[PDB]
Symmetry: D2
Subunit: 30 residues, 4 copies
């Protein structure tokens, strides 16, 4: 259903954004 899958997709998108910022932190500090 749209709602439940939209909540899943929105979560995945923000988890990817968190990984982006975490990887940037890791690289900058390396």
């Amino acid at each position: 259903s749209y709602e439940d899958q939209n909540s899943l997709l929105k979560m995945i998108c923000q988890q990817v954004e968190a990984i982006k910022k975490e990887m940037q932190e890791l690289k900058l500090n390396s």
Copy 2:
């Protein structure tokens, strides 16, 4: 510190595995 880097990379890898599993649950039309 190296421990800070390790813990950060550990979480990144956990989060990537979580996204990998979540994307197998996503139904584009439902």
Copy 3:
């Protein structure tokens, strides 16, 4: 179209697996 989106999801899943393997390679060489 559904086919456009299914293609996109398949590409994303392949890309996620690649980053998983590369993050592991990074750790193995750390």
Copy 4:
């Protein structure tokens, strides 16, 4: 080490950004 892997760090960061953009392009129930 974490100090001799800039090229791989850069690759991972590029690939995470590419996934981010693709995730933002996904459409449900289209």
